[PDB]
Amino acid sequence: DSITQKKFLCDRTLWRIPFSSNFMSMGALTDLGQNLLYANSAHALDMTFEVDPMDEPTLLYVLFEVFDVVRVHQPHRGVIETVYLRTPFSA
């Protein structure tokens, strides 16, 4: 008499949850990312992860996807000015 066990493996990738109203990619700047609800006011965020136990210390690696940009300006010989902007989660 037997018992069946099912599982899966999914190495070298990252679990993703896009902040898109339909989870689809319709542009870098997502539609929800442009919603006035997340622009005109601040919000707190709570996340709860349930994971399989491991008999050793581990780390939850969360990637908050944002825009990490820079604009470079070279007005005169030997001059470099940079404007960095990262949002949300600005420096």
Partner: protein, 702 residues
Amino acid sequence: APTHDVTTDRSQRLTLRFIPVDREDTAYSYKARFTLAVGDNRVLDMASTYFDIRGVLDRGPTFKPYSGTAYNALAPKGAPNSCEWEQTHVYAQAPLSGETITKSGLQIGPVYADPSYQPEPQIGESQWNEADANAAGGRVLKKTTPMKPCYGSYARPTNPFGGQSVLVLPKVDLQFFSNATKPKVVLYSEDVNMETPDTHLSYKPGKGDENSKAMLGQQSMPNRPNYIAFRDNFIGLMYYNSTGNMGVLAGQASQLNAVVDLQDRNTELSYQLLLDSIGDRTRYFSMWNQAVDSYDPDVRIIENHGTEDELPNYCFPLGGIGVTDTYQAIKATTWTKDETFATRNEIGVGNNFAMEINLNANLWRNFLYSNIALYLPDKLKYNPTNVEISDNPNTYDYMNKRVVAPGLVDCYINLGARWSLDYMDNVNPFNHHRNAGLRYRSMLLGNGRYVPFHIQVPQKFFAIKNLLLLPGSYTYEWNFRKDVNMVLQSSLGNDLRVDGASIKFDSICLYATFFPMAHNTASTLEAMLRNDTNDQSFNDYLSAANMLYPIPANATNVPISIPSRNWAAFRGWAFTRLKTKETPSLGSGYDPYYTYSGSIPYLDGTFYLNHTFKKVAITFDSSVSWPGNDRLLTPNEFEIKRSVDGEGYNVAQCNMTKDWFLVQMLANYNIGYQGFYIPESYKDRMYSFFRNFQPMSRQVVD
């Protein structure tokens, strides 16, 4: 081709080399400063610059670029060498047949054997049917030489003829034997500088290494392979996202540093993923040490379809018969001896003598032991008997001597199933001798522990890696690491700081290549580019704020709280799980508690714990559940996988939920609302979901 305004006709070098203006080697970091000069009527694409480094590396004594031994690999693993011991006893072989033996030794042909190298152990009789020698000779090891199994035995030669006798100088003493007590056998005994550099004992009769009859049965075993080399894309060599060791790119006139980093950013992983998005990462390129970490899929997930051993396999006597008996010919009711035939004739009755072996079962079993058994969690292994073993579990000696029972992963393991051992799912599959990238990168340096190296290292920081630098002089400075556990990678992952690895940087230059652009054209381009309207701009590929949260052993629930902030332009979340032991602390120039040297998922992308997630609940303002709106089958949270208790909502013949499968297919390929199908391979890259999705099933006794 165009004939004007493209290239310059004036003298101009294509490649410039800059010597450091200032260098500062410290306890764990190297600091190099350069004055990057971009002459008039020239432009520079930073993508064409790189740091040219020369130095010396000592991989240490735990470096072993191969499986097996380099010494007498064909000898039975328990067979000894001709040796002697006190109890004076002897166990030896005399393969060289001689004419006669006198006080002067064996008569090779009136020439006697030169005791310094004759008889030569590799020379014996030329046929299988040799007549017993009236006089034989051979070498033997004196009782003063430690007994070791032939397999793995090595002794450097001490004379140009291959003699290995210890110099004084060659001390070879003759010993004669017999059953007129004339000598029938002669042994040229000697001491040799006995070594076993790539093997260890798998069995030792007792304690203490004193020669004895019991020691004749010691069993040798090859040491575990351990490739050591620089990381994929020279990861770790250069400081990134570390405030105390920030890089510098400033105009000698602007003074301000154009490089602004954050411990919050992940430049190495960002580069890893950028690379795979614009190219095929299966191809290697030595210049950047570009050879992705990988693993044998048949090792990660065992597919046991057995062995094709339908036919028996045998080994036979060299003569083809084996046991034979003497017979006399007879001629005919009354038979008489036939005088035309010799009196003694060798004839064998019945089938020949034979041994039997299952070649395919053995081959399969050897595969399982070497690639999976040896890599099992240490809790499944035990300490050896009568053999010293280190106290440090991060040590090669420890990992090499801990014994594992082959029965744990024998050839009948989950027969007929495609299944990864549960004990192996949470074990880093990239720290393995079958990791092609690491093996290639190791062999790129050579097969020896001592390696003088010369490498070219790329600039990965998004802000300046593709920047077109205009005329002017700039200070270009960067910091490099010296910590072996960071700059180097071993397939075993042992502590290279403790296991004697070391590196020294002798020189470092900066190379830059300039397109020989026509001067009137370069000038025009420059003027246009100095306009703020035409400012260049870039974004980091990974584009994310990186956060690490502790998960104590055996913990299951992990809540994180983000204080009230603005989320305009938020793109989403991505996540995995890491082992704390494999995640250095970049929050400093040096991590004192970092005693691991395997792959570093955080930086290289070798993630392998994605199956350990059960679910994720997301809430805004401690009330509003996202995404809510009754979208998912289980609306209040993202359920990744459900226990047999909820098979109903699972898919693709595994424990993953329909919700999750849908979300990942949409998120990665926009596939889901109009059917499920395999995404175009150009979009299903190396670090994509589908390409790596591996559902499995098996049955076990109830």
